[PDB]
Design a protein around this ligand. Structure first.
Ligand SMILES: CC[C@H]1OC(=O)[C@H](C)[C@@H](O[C@@H]2C[C@@](C)(OC)[C@@H](O)[C@H](C)O2)[C@H](C)[C@@H](O[C@@H]2O[C@H](C)C[C@H](N(C)C)[C@H]2O)[C@@](C)(O)C[C@@H](C)C(=O)[C@H](C)[C@@H](O)[C@@]1(C)O
Ligand SMILES: [Mg+2]
Ligand SMILES: [Mg+2]
Ligand SMILES: [Mg+2]
Ligand SMILES: [Mg+2]
Ligand SMILES: [Mg+2]
Ligand SMILES: [Mg+2]
Ligand SMILES: [Mg+2]
Ligand SMILES: [Mg+2]
Ligand SMILES: [Mg+2]
Ligand SMILES: [Mg+2]
Ligand SMILES: [Mg+2]
Ligand SMILES: [Mg+2]
Ligand SMILES: [Mg+2]
Ligand SMILES: [Mg+2]
Ligand SMILES: [Mg+2]
Ligand SMILES: [Mg+2]
Ligand SMILES: [Mg+2]
Ligand SMILES: [Mg+2]
Ligand SMILES: [Mg+2]
Ligand SMILES: [Mg+2]
Ligand SMILES: [Mg+2]
Ligand SMILES: [Mg+2]
Ligand SMILES: [Mg+2]
Ligand SMILES: [Mg+2]
Ligand SMILES: [Mg+2]
Ligand SMILES: [Mg+2]
Ligand SMILES: [Mg+2]
Ligand SMILES: [Mg+2]
Ligand SMILES: [Mg+2]
Ligand SMILES: [Mg+2]
Ligand SMILES: [Mg+2]
Ligand SMILES: [Mg+2]
Ligand SMILES: [Mg+2]
Ligand SMILES: [Mg+2]
Ligand SMILES: [Mg+2]
Ligand SMILES: [Mg+2]
Ligand SMILES: [Mg+2]
Ligand SMILES: [Mg+2]
Ligand SMILES: [Mg+2]
Ligand SMILES: [Mg+2]
Ligand SMILES: [Mg+2]
Ligand SMILES: [Mg+2]
Ligand SMILES: [Mg+2]
Ligand SMILES: [Mg+2]
Ligand SMILES: [Mg+2]
Ligand SMILES: [Mg+2]
Ligand SMILES: [Mg+2]
Ligand SMILES: [Mg+2]
Ligand SMILES: [Mg+2]
Ligand SMILES: [Mg+2]
Ligand SMILES: [Mg+2]
Ligand SMILES: [Mg+2]
Ligand SMILES: [Mg+2]
Ligand SMILES: [Mg+2]
Ligand SMILES: [Mg+2]
Ligand SMILES: [Mg+2]
Ligand SMILES: [Mg+2]
Ligand SMILES: [Mg+2]
Ligand SMILES: [Mg+2]
Ligand SMILES: [Mg+2]
Ligand SMILES: [Mg+2]
Lengths: 8, 96, 64, 76, 51
RNA sequence: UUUAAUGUUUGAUGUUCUAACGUUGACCCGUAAUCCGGGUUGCGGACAGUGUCUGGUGGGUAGUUUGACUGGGGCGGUCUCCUCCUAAAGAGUAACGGAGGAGCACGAAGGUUGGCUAAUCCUGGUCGGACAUCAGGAGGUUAGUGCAAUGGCAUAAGCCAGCUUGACUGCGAGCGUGACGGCGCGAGCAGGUGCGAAAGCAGGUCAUAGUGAUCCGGUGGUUCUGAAUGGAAGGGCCAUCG
RNA sequence: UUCCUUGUCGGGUAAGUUCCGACCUGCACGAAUGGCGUAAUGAUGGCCAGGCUGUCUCCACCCGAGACUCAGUGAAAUUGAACUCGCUGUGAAGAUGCAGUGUACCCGCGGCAAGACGGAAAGACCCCGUGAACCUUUACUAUAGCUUGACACUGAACAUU
RNA sequence: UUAUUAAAAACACAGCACUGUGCAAACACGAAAGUGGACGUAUACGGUGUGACGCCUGCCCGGUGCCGGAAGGUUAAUUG
RNA sequence: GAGGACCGAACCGACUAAUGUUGAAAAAUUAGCGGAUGACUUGUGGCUGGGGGUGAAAGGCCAAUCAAACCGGGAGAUAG
RNA sequence: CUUUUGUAUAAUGGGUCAGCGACUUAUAUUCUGUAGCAAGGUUAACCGAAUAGGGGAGCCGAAGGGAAACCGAGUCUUAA
């Protein structure tokens, strides 16, 4: 999973 | 010796002294050892042959510890002041 | 194997007749000029190791 | 932001109270000035510490024309 | 800061010395005191030298 | 001190030379071969190049470091020591709680003997005035203390002068304060001193800040050790410096 | 590229924080890590109009493949155990399970997703570790390479100082 | 061009410029022998930057780099 | 009868939307889309190797693995 | 169950059953218990028809003080 796409 | 990162006790404190090489080749004899030789004469080689001192020992001293009952001649050893009196009180004699 | 002596502790402690250890006092190496003479005089003889630190010395000296 | 400093506590005060039996050389009071003064058999150190010079009991008293507090030692 | 260490050498034969500090600038003359020499056990004049 | 001189050691730069060495110039042979080797010639030539030592440059490459506290972390502050409050009338007692200082000075600003007494104000008085020096009176420490704050100080610890080096060496009953390392107070002894007629007082300074363990070394001294023996080097011990 | 800012004025619209033209107060453009123009090109960014339409007002009906039922074969993620309602309060601070109280006959089938802080992957953000990797530099220390001289392979003669 | 979330304004490009390089070339891969550059020879070859074309490209050499200079100051191995 | 010319099949690509997302498929189908005589495209063999390659440059690609491939050893690394 | 100041917690972990799965071993050192011997105690390698017997090389203990030379029931400090 490419978790860094989640906008923080 | 680890104390949490504080300088430990064997390293905050200074070193002192030196080791003498002459102290390792010197022994002390008690009055109880003078009756454990054979012959009645006590020099360095009779004390070595009775397994009283070691083989590398080159100097010895008779000190006032225990008691001696027999006449004993001492040859080539050092004697303390009280042990000279105690060897002579038992009929012995001390020569260097 | 044998236990190895902490060799730097064997250069700073000597065992006495009843099993305690003696050591040389600190604070007597340099800036001696600014110190008082009574203070430097009392630092000259050897002292004994306190009770709380004795076990740490015993850990360093298994063959003493 | 500007403060934050303090010194270490000096453990001053009275070490031996009235009626306590002390040995010669015992420290009775630590003080800054002479809040207490030296009486009979009581010395005064260089930082005004009052100590015993004999064995006996500590005695406190107010003496003199200025009503000052004195510390003495009465031999037992 | 400004105050420089010196030492006072015994004028007897001994090597014994005391150490002290001295302001070099306001007092340029050499310090000289009679102090106890512990080797000969007398009071001898002592004189200033370098540390 | 200079010059010039004969015999004489090099050191350098320059100019020639060939015989080391180069030749990715030509020709021949091995040889059916633009490798290579030998040979014959030209060009260079003690240069260039390589080895050991050495100075520079060297993120081209490599191994690593780049603190903590913190009303999240960062940015900002702070980090040891001294005094006062918080601190609840013994000691101790936290906060990025409220407020200020230190990292010295002084052979006199230390010891002793003798002596002495302050601020401020009014009043009279040459320049002199709101404030100098002088006389008197009020007053009672509201002054002073080498530098912060507190506690002290008249028997003065404040001010003045004569003489001086105790701002001594070896020790120290007994106490205080620290987890420790350590730090502090101390009468009294031994030796030798200063002041005073004498009793006495003196081991720095009114007290409390003015500081840094160990290692590694440096410098003097010593009745210690000295790897066959006599020395020496090095080590130790004492004093002291970074 | 402009923070203040939707700067101000004109155009286009019934109405324009975008667009186009212009001004100059350029927080903080600018000349080959180019300045300013530019026909032609672009599955390039923005804006306007005509055609056209189910994008929409506002959806209706139809045709097919599933979903549904009958027969055959037959998975999966998950899962402490379950006799597994609501509301107000309490409570490791957002309750199916606790307190009070109200409602509730037993068991399926087709649907929908409000909750089970649903499932999935030991949070990528953030902090910590005296953790890692790789990258930078006038951080520290080294070093390859490049460069300096000395001696060696390296000799003959003659000048000047 | 980011095989598998980015096709672009990013990359390349013809053109321009500066810089090095005289041939056993500079440079690169190789402890080295060699090889590519090149069976090329400055109208050529490597590196750097900009980016068809048009009008153009102003001032600064104080700092860092680079090119040149050698009087002087300082300075290693070596000698002693 | 020129062209990194034009429209457009094969051939090579991958811009948009729907779908699928325990897929028909560990990157695809459908309908539209770009190039299509060239810096094209493709079969067969060969060469370049891990701090190394190759890169019209995305830290891309090197067997569904890449800011340092995979396999075996050091090795039971070390883990406050 | 774990972790915490604190868990019904909507914090962690476990679908269930069976089997396997985590404080060992060597050598040194100190304290304790027990046994042998006692101002003494005990051997290593090795030899040995071999758990016997020999082997006392060594180790610890009965004496400390000092940096040390050295002195010694004392010794060091100091001129004392
Ligand atoms: C197709 C099939 C795949 O599913 C997806 O790709 C979907 C479409 C992702 O998209 C999403 C889409 C996008 C918008 O998220 C919706 C983005 O936020 C994330 C990163 O990827 C999901 C859902 C992500 O979820 C979210 O990941 C976040 C880190 C936290 C978030 N939640 C815990 C808070 C969580 O739900 C997270 C990484 O992919 C899922 C991890 C566990 C996977 O590996 C998933 C299951 C894959 O295996 C799956 C089979 O391949
Ligand atoms: Mg010393
Ligand atoms: Mg070299
Ligand atoms: Mg690096
Ligand atoms: Mg921190
Ligand atoms: Mg903050
Ligand atoms: Mg402290
Ligand atoms: Mg109190
Ligand atoms: Mg004074
Ligand atoms: Mg003071
Ligand atoms: Mg010798
Ligand atoms: Mg308008
Ligand atoms: Mg405009
Ligand atoms: Mg610009
Ligand atoms: Mg320009
Ligand atoms: Mg320019
Ligand atoms: Mg242009
Ligand atoms: Mg356009
Ligand atoms: Mg419109
Ligand atoms: Mg069905
Ligand atoms: Mg069925
Ligand atoms: Mg409810
Ligand atoms: Mg509720
Ligand atoms: Mg229940
Ligand atoms: Mg209920
Ligand atoms: Mg649904
Ligand atoms: Mg539940
Ligand atoms: Mg969830
Ligand atoms: Mg939900
Ligand atoms: Mg986690
Ligand atoms: Mg560096
Ligand atoms: Mg992609
Ligand atoms: Mg492609
Ligand atoms: Mg896309
Ligand atoms: Mg795409
Ligand atoms: Mg495109
Ligand atoms: Mg180039
Ligand atoms: Mg460009
Ligand atoms: Mg130059
Ligand atoms: Mg074409
Ligand atoms: Mg076409
Ligand atoms: Mg497509
Ligand atoms: Mg298609
Ligand atoms: Mg097409
Ligand atoms: Mg990048
Ligand atoms: Mg690469
Ligand atoms: Mg791949
Ligand atoms: Mg690596
Ligand atoms: Mg492991
Ligand atoms: Mg290992
Ligand atoms: Mg658990
Ligand atoms: Mg646990
Ligand atoms: Mg928790
Ligand atoms: Mg607990
Ligand atoms: Mg908690
Ligand atoms: Mg509970
Ligand atoms: Mg639970
Ligand atoms: Mg959770
Ligand atoms: Mg679970
Ligand atoms: Mg189970
Ligand atoms: Mg036996
Ligand atoms: Mg004694």
């Amino acid at each position: 999973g490419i978790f860094s796409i989640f906008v923080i | 010796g680890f104390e949490g990162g504080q300088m430990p006790l064997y390293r905050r404190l200074p070193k002192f002294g030196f080791t003498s090489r002459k102290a390792a080749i010197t022994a002390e004899i008690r009055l109880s050892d003078l009756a454990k030789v054979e012959g009645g004469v006590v020099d360095l080689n009779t004390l070595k042959a009775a397994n009283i001192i070691g083989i590398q020992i080159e100097f010895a001293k008779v000190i006032l510890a225990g008691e001696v009952t027999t006449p004993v001649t001492v040859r080539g050893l050092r004697v303390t002041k009280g042990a000279r009196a105690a060897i002579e009180a038992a009929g012995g004699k001390i020569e260097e | 194997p044998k236990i190895k002596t902490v060799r730097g502790a064997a250069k700073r402690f000597k065992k006495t007749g009843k099993g305690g250890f003696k050591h040389k006092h600190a604070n007597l190496r340099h800036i001696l000029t600014k110190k008082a003479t009574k203070r430097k005089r009392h630092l000259r003889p050897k002292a004994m190791v306190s009770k709380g630190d004795l076990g740490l010395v015993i850990a360093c000296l298994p063959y003493a | 932001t500007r403060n934050g400093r303090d010194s270490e506590a000096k453990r001053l005060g009275v070490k031996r109270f009235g009626g306590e039996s002390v040995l010669a050389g015992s420290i009775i009071v630590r003080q800054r000035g002479t809040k207490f003064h030296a009486g009979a058999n009581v010395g005064c150190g260089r930082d005004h510490t009052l100590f015993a010079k004999a064995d006996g009991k500590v005695k406190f008293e107010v003496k003199g024309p200025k009503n000052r507090k004195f510390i003495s030692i009465e031999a037992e | 800061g400004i105050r420089e260490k010196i030492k006072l050498v015994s004028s007897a034969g001994t090597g014994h010395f005391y150490t002290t500090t001295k302001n070099k600038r306001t007092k340029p003359e050499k310090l000289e005191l009679k102090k106890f020499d512990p080797v000969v056990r007398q009071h001898v004049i002592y004189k200033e030298a370098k540390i």
